[PDB]
Amino acid sequence: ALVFFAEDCGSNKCAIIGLMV
Amino acid sequence: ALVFFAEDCGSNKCAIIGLMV
Amino acid sequence: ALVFFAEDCGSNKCAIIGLMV
Amino acid sequence: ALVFFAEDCGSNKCAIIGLMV
Amino acid sequence: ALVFFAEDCGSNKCAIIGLMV
Amino acid sequence: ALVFFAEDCGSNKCAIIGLMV
Amino acid sequence: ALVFFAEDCGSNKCAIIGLMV
Amino acid sequence: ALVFFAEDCGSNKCAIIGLMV
Amino acid sequence: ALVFFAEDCGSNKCAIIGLMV
Amino acid sequence: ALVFFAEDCGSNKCAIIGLMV
Amino acid sequence: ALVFFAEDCGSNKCAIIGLMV
Amino acid sequence: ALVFFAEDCGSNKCAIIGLMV
Ligand SMILES: COCCO[C@@H](C)CO[C@@H](C)CO[C@H](C)CO[C@H](C)CO[C@@H](C)CO[C@@H](C)CO[C@H](C)CO[C@H](C)COC[C@@H](C)N
Numbered sequence: 393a394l395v396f397f398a399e400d401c402g403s404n405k406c407a408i409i410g411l412m413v
Numbered sequence: 414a415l416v417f418f419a420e421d422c423g424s425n426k427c428a429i430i431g432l433m434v
Numbered sequence: 435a436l437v438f439f440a441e442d443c444g445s446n447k448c449a450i451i452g453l454m455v
Numbered sequence: 456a457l458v459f460f461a462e463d464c465g466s467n468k469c470a471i472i473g474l475m476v
Numbered sequence: 477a478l479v480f481f482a483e484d485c486g487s488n489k490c491a492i493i494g495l496m497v
Numbered sequence: 498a499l500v501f502f503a504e505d506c507g508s509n510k511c512a513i514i515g516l517m518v
Numbered sequence: 519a520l521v522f523f524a525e526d527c528g529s530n531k532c533a534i535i536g537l538m539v
Numbered sequence: 540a541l542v543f544f545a546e547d548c549g550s551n552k553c554a555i556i557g558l559m560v
Numbered sequence: 561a562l563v564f565f566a567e568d569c570g571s572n573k574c575a576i577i578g579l580m581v
Numbered sequence: 582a583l584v585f586f587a588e589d590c591g592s593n594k595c596a597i598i599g600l601m602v
Numbered sequence: 603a604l605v606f607f608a609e610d611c612g613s614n615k616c617a618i619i620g621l622m623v
Numbered sequence: 624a625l626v627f628f629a630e631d632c633g634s635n636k637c638a639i640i641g642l643m644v
């Protein structure tokens with residue numbers, strides 16, 4: 393599958409996360 | 414415009430946000 | 435099917451609408 | 456992550472569900 | 477238009493459906 | 498950014514709007 | 519709702535169509 | 540890459556096409 | 561939920577996969 | 582396939598482009 | 603919110619930008 | 624056009640690919 397990357401800033405901290413589809 | 418609603422969740426808490434198109 | 439929830443806004447007045455799939 | 460919501464309907468049975476991204 | 481396909485499952489009952497755009 | 502165009506038909510009027518990404 | 523416009527060339531002829539969401 | 544399938548329909552006929560991401 | 565159909569391809573070899581919603 | 586249209590901007594040198602699906 | 607990243611090109615003057623959701 | 628990036632994990636290997644819109 394494809395893994396997109398986004399900075400999840402919804403949490404207090406910002407963190408790079410993968411988004412797998 | 415269209416307004417979609419989503420919970421913006423973090424490491425612990427979440428908040429209702431609008432997503433406008 | 436899935437029914438997504440959205441608000442159709444315009445002229446400072448919104449209305450709940452469904453979006454079906 | 457973001458949590459969207461949808462009404463998942465089958466055979467006259469519907470239940471709100473989350474969809475996490 | 478384009479016609480996508482999905483398996484719509486409810487309570488152990490699934491049926492292929494079209495989704496037209 | 499890409500500027501898509503859509504007709505936003507609210508309640509009192511429609512209007513060609515931009516939607517930039 | 520929003521009405522997007524696309525040239526539907528899937529048909530032999532190409533034609534502007536609306537896509538309502 | 541991911542390959543989605545759709546019927547590319549016209550005024551009369553349709554054809555299976557791939558949509559690659 | 562909806563189950564979308566896709567092929568995961570790579571190195572000249574694809575495999576059917578589901579994508580659930 | 583469907584052909585959407587967008588204004589592709591770059592340092593404010595926008596122009597109409599097609600986006601095929 | 604989530605922040606995706608893309609290379610926004612214009613006459614081949616690409617640069618990284620954020621795309622917030 | 625915007626160039627998004629994703630990790631395309633097939634069967635023999637992953638690889639950072641582009642996906643331009
Ligand atoms: C800003 O442009 C985003 C395009 O960049 C892509 C790299 C984004 O990648 C995707 C995987 C992540 O996109 C997010 C879902 C946010 O974008 C979508 C378009 C949100 O759009 C909203 C306005 C749509 O509102 C409702 C219909 C929510 O719809 C979501 C997308 C339904 O959930 C999806 C189908 C579940 O994800 C797929 C699963 C198999 N991983």
Ligand SMILES: COCCO[C@@H](C)CO[C@@H](C)CO[C@H](C)CO[C@H](C)CO[C@@H](C)CO[C@@H](C)CO[C@H](C)CO[C@H](C)COC[C@@H](C)N
Nearest residue numbers: 453454455480495497501522537538539543558564600602
């Ligand atoms: C090229 O960028 C497209 C973004 O421009 C927008 C103006 C497009 O507008 C939308 C309304 C039309 O987009 C078409 C559906 C094609 O784009 C989508 C992203 C096709 O993507 C494929 C690869 C996804 O494959 C499966 C999951 C098919 O998913 C479709 C989108 C599911 O059907 C949708 C949710 C039904 O449409 C919504 C309905 C309420 N009108």
